[PDB]
Symmetry: C5
Subunit: 312 residues, 5 copies
């Protein structure tokens, strides 16, 4: 119920450690994700060291109350974690052992500049206040950090789960503080995004382009306009995707380029028909023959330039 007293001036060190169990429900628009894991703490307290020979036992057990557990809080959580203690043990020399299970929802920003092929890093922070006149510092136990082989996040791949051993210390509300950082690195599985999204747009665009090999005005108008309507519907079907961003991403630029191409195609069809009506078939034929080759080459060049810009 009382913090240990310092011998001369030394602070107290607490050894932490987090062991993941499962990550799920990674919301894109809300920029949150849920998690449940094991939390382990250990600290040394000489005031409760007992006699092993006299008592005949090596390690004594206890109960969650009536003993000094340091407070540990999470910075970026919407609500306090739901907790239940699993074990408390005391070593002969005084060091304490602890274990608990918790579940919480974390807040972390995301970067969507390369949304189909992006990589993200999620941060978890642990913080402890300088209680009483004893300074409290945090340490990382490298043997108590890990994850289960059954930890699966849908559509994501897990690369590493480490902790920055060196903490960050500063003064907040006229009191010293220490903050620990846990980093989880993930990479998106982009294979499914190709056949379900990318290729149908190309097919519809080529269907639009196929109108340069024709002369009838009504057929060309029907083709181009119905293809544009189909593109709008596909954009509606795709909109279940990244939220509004302060920057320009890859997919947004591609979609805008597609809209521009549709507008230019409509302009070309109108120009060709207007020239044909004015009894100048040669100019219309030259224009359509030029456009036949001009359109795909410009599309490929613009796509290459965009890929250079966003990945170079």
């Amino acid at each position: 119920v009382s913090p240990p007293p310092p011998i001369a001036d030394e602070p107290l060190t607490v050894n932490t450690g987090i062991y993941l169990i499962e990550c799920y429900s990674l919301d894109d628009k809300a920029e949150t994700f849920k998690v449940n894991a094991f939390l382990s703490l250990s600290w040394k307290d000489r005031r409760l060291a007992f006699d092993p020979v006299r008592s005949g036992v090596r390690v004594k057990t206890y109960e969650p109350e009536a003993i000094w557990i340091p407070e540990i809080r999470f910075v970026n959580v919407e609500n306090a974690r739901d907790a239940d203690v699993v074990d408390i043990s005391v070593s002969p020399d005084g060091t304490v052992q602890y274990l608990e299970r918790f579940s919480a929802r974390v807040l972390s920003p995301l970067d969507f500049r390369r949304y189909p092929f992006d990589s993200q890093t999620l941060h978890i922070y642990l913080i402890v206040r300088s209680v009483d006149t004893r300074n409290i510092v945090l340490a990382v136990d490298l043997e108590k950090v890990g994850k289960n082989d059954d930890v699966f996040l849908t559509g994501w791949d897990i690369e590493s789960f480490t902790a920055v051993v060196k903490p960050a210390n500063f003064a907040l509300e006229d009191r010293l503080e220490s903050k620990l950082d846990y980093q989880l690195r993930i990479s998106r599985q982009y294979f499914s995004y190709i056949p379900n999204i990318i290729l149908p747009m190309l097919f519809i665009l080529f269907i639009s382009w196929t109108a340069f090999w024709s002369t009838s005005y009504e057929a060309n108008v029907t083709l181009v306009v119905s293809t544009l309507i189909a593109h709008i519907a596909f954009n509606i079907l795709v909109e279940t995707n990244l939220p509004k961003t302060p920057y320009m991403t890859y997919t947004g630029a591609i979609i805008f380029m597609i809209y521009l191409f549709y507008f230019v195609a409509v302009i070309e069809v109108t120009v060709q028909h207007y020239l044909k009506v004015e009894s100048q078939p040669a100019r219309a034929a030259s224009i359509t023959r030029a456009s036949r080759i001009a359109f795909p080459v410009v599309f490929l060049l613009a796509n290459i330039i965009l890929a250079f810009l966003f990945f170079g």
Copy 2:
């Protein structure tokens, strides 16, 4: 335990300051948002002066029980805040330092009259419970008011976070109760809205307008009606994100004007065809030539007038 007597015959002033940590879940339908922040208080009570040199200068850590803590309640909260005491400290002169941490849901109105380019303001209200013997008033501490640099809202950029005073006896209640006000000014990042919404709408409108350079009735009818269908689909896509509001905004006026323009274009096409059939081609040609320049100028003038009306 007991209220501090007014031996000095002075009002019991406090020093209140809120330090933010992060804000999240700014709902539009329910007109509310969540918060997670500290709360620091400081008041003078000479009943527990601690001049002697018993223990260090930080003569402190009285438990939350067996001590008089002024009770502070929020006003515009859906549910009572959750509280957890962090520090309780006493200076030898007589002032007592106190701190907490809380999470709550705050209700505050929003005004989407300029939805793409609007700025909002969020209010937090503070009230102290009076005491029969003495009097309590509020005050703000400039140093203790601030926010972390890690605060973020999805789509909003924070500008300022200040505190102002509001005189007492709010509403019909007049039990000498003073209240405080906290304002968080925010803006909306409106860059991404341009290439996502505005430009495709103009492209579709221009595609529809291209019908004035033709004389085929069937092609013109197909162009105009199919572009109207595309306009309706894009309206569905736009409304998917825009929160519902029971009043008139900027985007609603723009959409209504677009519908009106489509109706007028259909009327013009019908008039041109009917005049042409009656063996009066000169009048039809003159009408379409006039409309070619009439439509964009009127559209630009209407947009300018609307912009001046809503933003001035």
Copy 3:
């Protein structure tokens, strides 16, 4: 604590009053509806006044576990309300003043007929638990009943807020009549709904009607059928901002009438083309010239009749 003892067989009257704050969160399909508001009691406590003296004329402020607080329950709440007392003032004489802030999910019937121009009435029912002493009666307190002039019920303008003691009985008791009924009459602001829904529908219908000034079968077919498709898409858009109503409605009647008009227009166009093919141009011209005038007049007459029928 204990309830006040009988004095001269005088029943205990409780003057109640609700001070509205917020009316928001219209959840589900217009069945559940959240309320945040204050709540005021005033029951005399004669022959038990605490420290009554002119030397102690200062207003007495007490704690909830210090005086007898009557128990009041809401009849139609999904779950028991979350009580939160703001402050308690006890006069030296035999009277008390109570004020608390609550939040509950209230269930009330909503009628959506006359959906754009409807008025709603919300009822909340109050009963008070009886004790072994004399019967506790309920009465209205006119002074404390009212709003704060700044209720954030968006889209609705509040007309009045009154209360009546309606005699009722549910299961079994001598009186059981101690029930209060507070009614909050509200009305909807329908101005935005006109340009949001009504006018585009008429524009589309007129665009469909433009086919009577033509003689091209292909043009008429394209016009009418594509306009029908646009009408279906606009209906899909309209159904989003509207709850599920399992009963007839003004808007539903209008939509059905529009569908019938489209069907009749298709029939007329087919008949005209068939006659023209069978070489009866005079009959075809007479039919179309009659329809040009017949359609809008019947539309207006049906609309007038429907409005008169639905709106008394």
Copy 4:
């Protein structure tokens, strides 16, 4: 706080009853519905004895935690009910008048074979356990079962609310239990479903059929294909209805029939055009004339057969 001392070897019995207040949120996706109601129980215990000799009283309330109460639990519920004791009393002979209000969400299967015109039955199950050596069985008090005139469910009609007097004892987990059954019979209101769903589809089908009075191939193709697209869009709009079911429903069969009719119409139009091209106009005219009368008759016969098959 112990079970009653058995005055004999007879099994202790408890008679109960449920009084409904409101039924709402009859979800069909998860086959659930919410409800709140009064629960009334009564038993006998010689531990409590009144004092008619000591001038008597008539109510003499108590508090729930002070007396033994049998544990009543519901079988098919989401979680434990939210029960707050409203009134508990006693009598000179020693009968306890228990009355609590509870809210819960119930699980019950639904049958959707006649979805537009279907009637269902909902079940609530009560259960008790054999405590100590004293066996406990349940009884039904017909005076405490019923619903008030204010019980309304949106879009449904209430028929009856009864309880089977005879329980169904069984041995589970080496113990004997008794179960009570409460049934609530409801019937759907179907009038609003006709002009909202049934008739527009018939109008679209007739618009598709009107293509047998023409000879132009392009107009027929446009009519049939655009009507098919409109039917698909209407199905998209209507899809907010009954979920996936193991069996086959009425509306699903009707929709499949409509799809078959559309396919047959396309085949007929193509065959007629192919015959017309091949310089055999007489056969094409005969086929069209036959189909004109063959389509509606087959549609009517199929509808009659389906009606006899499902509702007969």
Copy 5:
């Protein structure tokens, strides 16, 4: 209160059994499902005994709090289960029976690689908190396991519910802890999927394929492009009821193949028209005649190959 003495050679063995009552709310995006079932335990403790002699008529005894209870914790469960003790019984010889009732949420992987015709498996994991003095391992009781006949899942049928023993020393910790696996095998009822999904899409494709029996370019382009739009709308309808799957499934392959077929059909129509324009009708006729037979055969072959690749 105290752990059992380690007298026997074998560690303490508990007999666990789960009796399902019902399951519900199977969410697929988060891959969770809630449960409601029993929990029956048993073990032998020789510390206390009840001799049949000396008024040993009482075979069974009840200890609410004055007895040692092994505690069971769930692993793949989002929040701690809500359990309430039902009954505790003690045999005269020493064997102790124990029962509860719980309800919680479960996290389990899902595999939608055969979405219409897939079978899943739901897991529940149980662990025991080791005691210092003695040792505990789990065991299964086949007569304490099972499910009630009133269990139901909307769209599934239950095959079996069995249990097995998982190896000790799970995860990184090796503190002689054992785990229990409860297997629930279900299958998806797919009868309603055929006439709701598969047949309409085939009908639309067959309608589109009729363009090979015509020579009119306008009719061909109208048919193909409008059927493409209809396919996109039907894809929206199909996806509406499908949870998001960030991988490649059977239905996605089918849809992509349909898109490819539409693109090839457009190319063929364009080639036929272009060849006909240059006065080479024999080659165009040969091409269309070949395509008439080529398309269905290739479609069937691709379908067979996909079926063998995914279900073999």
